[PDB]
Point group: D2
């Protein structure tokens, strides 16, 4: 009684959509290394043998797109035609133009940096939950860690049949507690991972349980009733872009909260700080996690929204799930007194000209590595 | 006291991402017209002068991609280089391969149709709210209608300076009422729309208020405090793919609930019914709207999830926001007794081999035109 | 005294331009297998990881371009990323539209087949020389045979370090004899061939002399003065499209007479019989070889030309180098009495709807395998 | 008696192949403006809505390919979707990598500039004929001038129905005179030119005769027997890349001697001086024209050939058609005493690092504007 299921997924570094996110952010970082004020909107598309870059960049940097793309693919692990994709020999196509001058004049031309307009309209959410120390849902934390474990065991050679393309999915049974949520047990785990031709299904399923799941998921969460769907398709030799086209910004729930919270629809990768889809979502995460680590909430959702060309957010909303003694109105007032959500101030607070974006583009943007948006702000009230 | 803001956005038919969604679904419909069992996973990318199709199709149809793409762009209204894009003269590139045989064998090969596996893993949500007759959030309903009004006034020649690329955003002030939400007033409206070189800002802003906003939004919602951001960038001559690259599946919140509810991350357009991202999200909407129209809830969120190759959902969850006398456990039991969420049963219930998908690919997939997922199921309990 | 040098080159099946010619003709043959009246103008471009098809096809055939392209690349031998290109994993992009209706109406619409117009304007030459039995210049015959020998030794595994991309060049010293030419000796041979990383230059140069040159070139032509440039660049590991972009119709002298004779500029591959660039050049070869095998000339050049939409050639010219007792005017009259050079008659005489074109697209179109244009017509005069 | 026909063609600036040549050379010039030692091998492909650049460039220049391509297309005149192509709105795709290091090390790395190796193997020809002052065949001179006249009348607005895509073809009746050739009369003229929808065939044919042919071709060459094929297809509204795919290096006979002389197969455009296809063909033209203007020959063909990595030509041959009192052996000795045909010396003599290449890429590379290869060298003997 009072229990429910919730499911989240994650994907690996070689999932084709995630390849695109990583490449887009490799391009962004390459520009930022030379020009901290680069305007970047780089979409990547991946299909058999092809990486296409399409979008808009205005920058003083000189970037060798061939080299940057190929290095990103190399890092992921696609280095031979036997794996379905090879950084050495794939096609790299570039369709990158300047930023529209109409956008530039309306957003940033001649504006004081603190008073730059949002680079687009849109809405964004931040979320935090005290169910884990890092203030993330357990479902997606576990899903990410399963993909990370696959990559680890691939790279260290202990499961050399593994390839870079993987997906995981975790269903947890929760109890609720005055609006907060309490994990009880893992109900179902899915793992699918690309593999070499020679390994059999039974060898894979045994390894996935023993060397992946048991290594990652605490035994206290696994019991006789847990359902395992390990290599449920039965065969996954074809993978990466050869198996499924990839695009930037097609894993936005994997990138964020795994179905928990909410999403405003904007993708992160390939975008500089003036694109509030990224900067304001990072800031909203920072606000949410500041409220939870500050002891004001156990769980909270923050919405913000913007108009192109306008600095200040159009709206800010706080939803605390009943997990605060303060009203949502009071929390909103605390937020407004402690945060300035103009993009030209977020950039300073969160150090958003620094070329660290490729590191964000797999395993989620939140809940790890003490990025600036993960370090709570101390609140005055 | 008790009030909050919420913001949602929509985009027009000529927004570059939406162009891609429409093209992807034009391709799907073209295949389904000849082969109801076509397996389609068609991604579209749009940039200056270019439509690229990339993905996987296994079908008995013979489809003229050149023709289908160009006709979709023609419908949208991009028919001259003065508008930034022309169906007659753009490049159409095709990188479409067969569906992976490894996927096919794991999903649908040799399986009874009712027992086809999900075409992928993933999670999906359905949502319904009694705040409007069509059981959609007012914020996004209004946002969509503003874009539809722009297209209407473009097509009828009364505002001939309009071009197809538009975005809108609506912030509503709400009151809550026992978990349900009650719209009070429109707080802020944003409209940005591509325009010809000759029309001035003041002419546009006057028209957008008088002929667009007032035509769509009830006066009772607009007052002296409402904020209007009309052509806030000041100039939007460059637009469509020339101004911003488009991709399929980059408007998934516009396609669904505008930030309300939740999203599992999967895109709809370009996918046949075996891709549960679409079919199970449609079914989840159908469940949610059935619960609200059936009088069981005022507002409800439904989660479902799947594993590739497995027919039955892995999990089902119901969240009623406190708006039912029945427990969430009781509602879940009603759902399980009344719905079969296998993809090979959803296809029959929702008629998902019918080539009506292009019609879904602008102005949201939900809350309009009495598609099968909008017709409540009568529940037995 | 009276001697001169002449040089011709050839390239192998994996030279990037020749890859394109072969793919274009694989596409043509695929169409002709289903629709003998297909209108085909298929250009191919090759670069790292990419085959692009661009051009115009109007056909009743259903052709799987992915499959046809990949099979052609497989035949050539590019089957692994270690070789720089892999048919399994490369990108195939398609930008093929219908034939222009304006062309169609002016060329073939509603016209009796014998009276179809030329598909374009242009000029074409045929050439024949009695210096070899097959009526080809010795320089290019030898150059082709050197590339064929490389491919043979690659395919049979005796030189497993060889890759498909090769070039050869042969300089012969000739004497003249009343307008005819008499080979004396080979002055210089060049061979460059892509190779694996592990083989050293000395091993390659020894093999190229002993196993390639000596196997192909009669010893009577090689002496102490012959110059050998074997792997003259010193290193050729990177090759195929990765080393150099390829295009259809960039080897038109290799395809024909090696610098001897003349050329009107039109490419052969990827074109159906209505494109007189191919059909009329084949017919001109047939005329030239008929004059030499008929005993009228020892050496002869034939020019023809056409206007788009017009059936009969605009001009015909015969140049016999002084090697006939008959005047050029008399030979022209014999040609006109014995040949009908309308494209809709050439197609019947030379069987040009038959899908044998891929076989023409390496090692020259002339002087081998008794194609119809190589079988002399018996002349009446 | 003693007369014969000869035909040559030319194409206009907007013919799709010529568009590609011009773009390739615009790219070369852009690089040379910043880096005189740029290594450039830029192929261009054009089809509906698309310019693709593919090839190899190693340069210190920073070139904005978008801008350079679009400016070249603008110059040609494709500036509106009504014309079938628009520089403002077409797709520009870039697939340009570095020059292969294996090539670089074998050709130019660490070599004294005069002693740089040829950038490839190949053969090249130069030709000159005293039949015109500029030492070019009359057939192609006239063909070029007809296309130039079309462009002139398009640009000055007197025939505003003209579009940039055109082709011409001229057949001249000649007499021979001791190996030299003497034009007598124009036998046939073809002109095809893209046109707007509204102009009728009779208006076009009248204009083409009166305003184009009569303006260009001396009346003494036109008589009652001359055949005119003016707009012979009847309709040519669709044109440019939309009507026919273009590629660099598909007009190599138009670029040179119109079927006269010979050709070694290599294309000119998009290549720096180390590519002997261009530099040695220019030098061979210079030699030929020096022999004719020096009074040694009336007509002459020069062959040269190279091996990759080797500076000096492998072979040189002179054919004087019987038009000199000196033997061909004597002429060869004069050539060898007066010319150094190493590429690293040709570059100095012919100023081949200067960014003048786009000017060569329509209307032929020879016989006009007193380029260095058109200024005879004064010979010592
Ligand atoms: C199954 S595919 C999406 C549907 C696909 N585009 C189609 O044509 O049916 C989505 C992801 O699943 C994974 N995948 C690919 N092949 C698979 C297989 N044989 N078994 C399981 N998962 C697979 C990869 O991570 C891929 O990016
Ligand atoms: C502003 S753009 C996204 C950022 C962009 N890629 C860049 O390079 O900065 C997103 C959408 O805004 C709209 N847009 C384009 N140009 C605009 C302008 N000048 N003013 C307002 N909105 C514009 C179009 O709907 C476009 O698809
Ligand atoms: C040398 S490349 C043409 C020039 C080249 N595009 C560049 O960037 O310098 C022409 C042909 O030579 C051959 N080739 C490629 N790399 C070579 C090498 N390292 N040594 C010799 N020949 C090579 C291949 O057959 C190739 O298609
Ligand atoms: C006729 S096309 C080549 C054949 C063509 N690729 C096909 O699909 O049949 C070659 C050139 O002829 C010219 N051309 C195009 N359309 C034409 C027409 N309707 N009439 C005459 N010439 C035309 C253009 O200069 C074009 O580049
Ligand atoms: K968000
Ligand atoms: K996909
Ligand atoms: K969803
Ligand atoms: K974008
Ligand atoms: K020819
Ligand atoms: K090349
Ligand atoms: K030449
Ligand atoms: K063509
Ligand atoms: Mg995806
Ligand atoms: Mg957005
Ligand atoms: Mg977008
Ligand atoms: Mg998904
Ligand atoms: Mg080439
Ligand atoms: Mg031609
Ligand atoms: Mg051509
Ligand atoms: Mg060559």
């Amino acid at each position: 009684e009072g229990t429910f299921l919730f499911t989240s997924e994650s994907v690996g570094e070689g999932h084709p959509d995630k390849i695109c996110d990583q490449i887009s952010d490799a391009v962004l970082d390459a520009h930022l290394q030379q020009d901290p004020d680069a305007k970047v909107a780089c979409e990547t598309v991946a299909k058999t043998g092809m990486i296409l870059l399409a979008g808009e960049i205005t920058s003083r940097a000189a970037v060798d797109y061939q080299k940057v793309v190929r290095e990103a693919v190399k890092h992921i692990g696609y280095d031979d035609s036997s794996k379905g994709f090879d950084y050495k020999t794939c096609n790299v196509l570039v369709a990158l133009e300047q930023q529209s001058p109409d956008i530039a004049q309306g957003v940033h031309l001649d504006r004081n940096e603190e008073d730059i307009g949002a680079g687009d309209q849109g809405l964004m959410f931040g979320y935090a939950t005290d169910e884990t120390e890092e203030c993330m849902p357990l479902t997606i934390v576990l899903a990410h860690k399963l993909n990370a474990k696959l990559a680890e065991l691939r790279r260290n050679g202990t499961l050399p049949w593994l390839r870079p393309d993987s997906k995981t999915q975790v269903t947890v049974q929760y109890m609720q507690d005055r609006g907060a949520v309490l994990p009880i047990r893992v109900h179902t785990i899915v793992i699918s991972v690309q593999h070499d031709e020679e390994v059999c299904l039974d060898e894979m399923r045994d390894a996935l349980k023993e060397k992946v799941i048991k290594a990652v998921v605490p035994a206290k969460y696994l019991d006789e009733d847990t359902i395992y769907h390990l290599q449920p398709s039965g065969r996954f030799v074809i993978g990466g872009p050869q198996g499924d086209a990839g695009l930037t910004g097609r894993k936005i729930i994997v990138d964020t909260y795994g179905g928990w919270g909410a999403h405003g629809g904007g993708a992160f990768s390939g975008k500089d700080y003036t694109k509030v889809d990224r900067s304001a979502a990072y800031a909203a995460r920072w606000v949410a996690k500041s409220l939870v680590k500050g002891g004001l909430c156990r769980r909270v959702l923050v919405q913000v929204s913007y108009a192109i060309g306008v600095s200040h957010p159009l709206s800010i909303s706080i939803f605390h799930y009943g997990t605060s003694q303060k009203s949502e109105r009071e929390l909103l007032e605390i937020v407004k007194k402690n945060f300035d959500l103009r993009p030209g101030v977020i950039v300073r607070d969160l150090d958003l000209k620094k070329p660290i974006y490729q590191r964000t583009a797999a395993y989620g943007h939140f809940g790890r590595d003490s990025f600036p948006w993960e370090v709570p702000k101390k609140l005055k009230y």
